[PDB]
Design brief:
Layout lengths: L3 E3 L20 H4 L6 E3 L5 H8 L9 H14 L9 H5 L15 H5 L3 H16 L7 E5 L3 E3 L7 E5 L1 H23 L9 H13 L4 E6 L4 H4 L2 H11 L6 H15 L2 E4 L5 E5 L9 H20 L2 E8 L2 E7 L3 H17 L22 E7 L5 E7 L2 H12 L6 H8 L4 H18 L6 E5 L2 E5 L4 H9 L11 H14 L4 H17 L2 H10 L14 H4 L19
Parallel strand pairs: 3-7
Antiparallel strand pairs: 1-8, 2-4, 3-5, 6-10, 7-8, 9-10, 11-12, 13-14
Helix pairs in contact: 3-7, 3-10, 3-12, 6-7, 7-11, 7-12, 10-11, 12-13, 16-19, 19-20
The structure holds 3-(3-tert-butylphenyl)pyridin-2(1H)-one and zinc ion.
């Protein structure tokens, strides 16, 4: 039961790829060790093929079947609706991959006759045909990292026509079902603030808390045909229209279970018998499968008071400790159970007794103080990848601006406030592009956001404290400092000086710009200003925000 079989044909790009960090007049002000920053290309995809290709062995016990029956019972209370062509089309990103059948992402959004006619043809084909495998494109991702070198991640996706039909049949399912089935354990329902609140409250509800994260070695490749069929049986519990049921069964047999892999040149690269990274159900299916395997493994390990938190392939468990030795022994049983269910780990899980030492979604909980010196818990991460990606975005215009998403999600952090906000507001002031909307990703979904709306947005998912945080933990400070030394980023003292300039330039401009200088850069000045609740914060249509994960699912909000 091999995840992949290969013909020998290479994974080809759609354009000339850059691996070296592009340099411009703004590069040195952010980063000096340019050699450290790189981007993955299709020319390293052969290295990934080896890693993702392996045999999957699966042993399913009563604990697995018990949890599944409980999951199907909760799923049977979900009612999901069938979306119209126009509704699914409006959810398609503008930078989305064009169809092989004469149309693109912009044609889809504009509802061109050629696109809509093909979408209807694929839909009719899904209702009539449930055996023929759907063709997918295997492409290599261009992701930017810092060295110590990752090979390119793989992206497997069906044609744009199929992707719109996937939305019609499963967009409501993947948006409603996860929270009903997993309850508070479903991580994508939370804003960064609601997440820390949930982790801190959960950690505090235990007599002697123990927490750990579980890292599955190549989760998509570990997903078996059984897992994909089990996902469909859960989707089929919902109150669905007979067209949606037929399209779900069809997309499962023909696409989700597996199919041929085709490169950008139209050559057969091989066959996939695992999870596709570029389908609508990637996030949802990964969450269901992980939660199911982990819940049953909690039961097998006899873990006391298991509180789970699942986001795709990412898993955090907070439970009652039984001492260091009994915890280490319980984590072995948990891993033995996960391995049996075809979910072995990358690095073995380790018991942690300090919430701040637990890393899940590349993030950890940390503590700072607000204006009244009161302790305040927030989400942070190592700023290496956010800084390296920002350095690339300083020289090249990318379809998705990682720095904007990073300011949104990590707004209370030291590194995002002092470096990310400073640098990019400076760039925006210079080009007078403060009023221009930029595309960014939040839980895998694409959002067109106006940078002048940043103070209202941050207040809504972090609170007003985000603008007043100080007296940061020594662990977080040394982490940021270490990252700056590594990449050659100017010290935090230089960033304060620069922020005083950016702030004054923003305030001079008045209006929304003055609000950005006021709220975002209050930390930069000794004589602080009055940070009052913003009237525009309530007037934010945050509908769709923190409902579900859509990573690789081709979603625009
Ligand atoms: C920090 C937190 C809430 C754990 C998280 C989880 C998943 C994704 C993100 C994220 C970070 C940066 C940009 N966009 C995102 O969605 C952030
Ligand atoms: Zn039982």
């Amino acid at each position: 039961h091999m995840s992949y079989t290969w013909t020998g044909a290479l994974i080809t790009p759609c354009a000339a790829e850059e691996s070296k960090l592009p340099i411009n007049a703004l590069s040195n002000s952010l980063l000096r060790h340019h050699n450290m920053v790189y981007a993955t290309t299709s020319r390293s995809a052969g290295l990934r093929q080896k890693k993702v290709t392996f045999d999957r062995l699966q042993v399913l016990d009563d604990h697995y079947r018990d949890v599944l029956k409980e999951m199907k019972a909760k799923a049977s209370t979900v009612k999901a609706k069938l979306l119209s062509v126009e509704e699914a089309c409006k959810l398609t990103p503008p930078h989305s991959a064009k169809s092989k059948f004469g149309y693109g992402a912009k044609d889809v959004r504009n509802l061109s006759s050629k696109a809509v006619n093909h979408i209807h043809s694929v839909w009719k084909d899904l209702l009539e045909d449930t055996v023929t495998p759907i063709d997918t494109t295997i492409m290599a991702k261009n992701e930017v990292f810092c060295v110590q070198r990752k090979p390119a991640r793989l992206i497997v996706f069906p044609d744009l026509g199929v992707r719109v039909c996937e939305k019609m049949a499963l967009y409501d399912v993947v948006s409603t079902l996860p929270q009903v089935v997993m309850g508070s354990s479903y991580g994508f329902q939370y804003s960064p603030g609601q997440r820390v609140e949930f982790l801190v409250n959960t950690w505090k509800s235990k007599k002697n808390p123990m927490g750990f994260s579980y890292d599955t070695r190549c989760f998509d490749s570990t997903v078996t045909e059984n897992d994909i069929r089990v996902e469909e049986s859960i989707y089929q519990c919902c109150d669905l229209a007979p067209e949606a049921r037929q399209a779900i069964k069809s997309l499962t047999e023909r696409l989700y279970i597996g199919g041929p892999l085709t490169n950008s040149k139209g050559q057969n690269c091989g066959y996939r018998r695992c999870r596709a990274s570029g389908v609508l159900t990637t996030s949802c299916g990964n969450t269901l499968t992980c939660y199911l395997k982990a819940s049953a493994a909690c039961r097998a390990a006899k873990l006391q008071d298991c509180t789970m938190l699942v986001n795709g392939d990412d898993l955090v468990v907070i439970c009652e400790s039984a001492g260091t030795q009994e915890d280490a022994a319980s984590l072995r049983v948990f891993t033995e159970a996960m391995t049996r269910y075809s979910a072995p780990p990358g690095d073995p899980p380790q018991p942690e007794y300090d919430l701040e030492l637990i890393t899940s979604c590349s993030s950890n909980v940390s503590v700072a103080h607000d204006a009244s010196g009161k302790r305040v818990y927030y989400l942070t991460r190592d700023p290496t990848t956010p800084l390296a990606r920002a350095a690339w975005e300083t020289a090249r215009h990318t379809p998705v601006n990682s720095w904007l998403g990073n300011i949104i999600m990590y707004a209370p952090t030291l590194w995002a406030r002092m470096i990310l906000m400073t640098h990019f507001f400076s760039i925006l002031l210079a080009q007078e592009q403060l009023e221009k909307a930029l595309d960014c990703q939040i839980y895998g979904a694409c959002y067109s956001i106006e940078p002048l709306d940043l103070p209202q947005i941050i207040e809504r998912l972090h609170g007003l404290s985000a603008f007043s945080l100080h007296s940061y933990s020594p662990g977080e400070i040394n982490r940021v400092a270490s990252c700056l030394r590594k990449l050659g980023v100017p010290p935090l003292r230089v960033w304060r000086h620069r922020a005083r300039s950016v702030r004054a330039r923003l305030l001079s401009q008045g209006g929304r710009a003055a609000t950005c200088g006021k709220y975002l850069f209050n930390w930069a000045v000794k004589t602080k200003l009055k940070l009052t609740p913003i009237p525009a914060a309530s007037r934010l249509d945050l509908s769709g925000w923190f409902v579900a994960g859509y990573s690789g699912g081709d979603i625009y909000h």
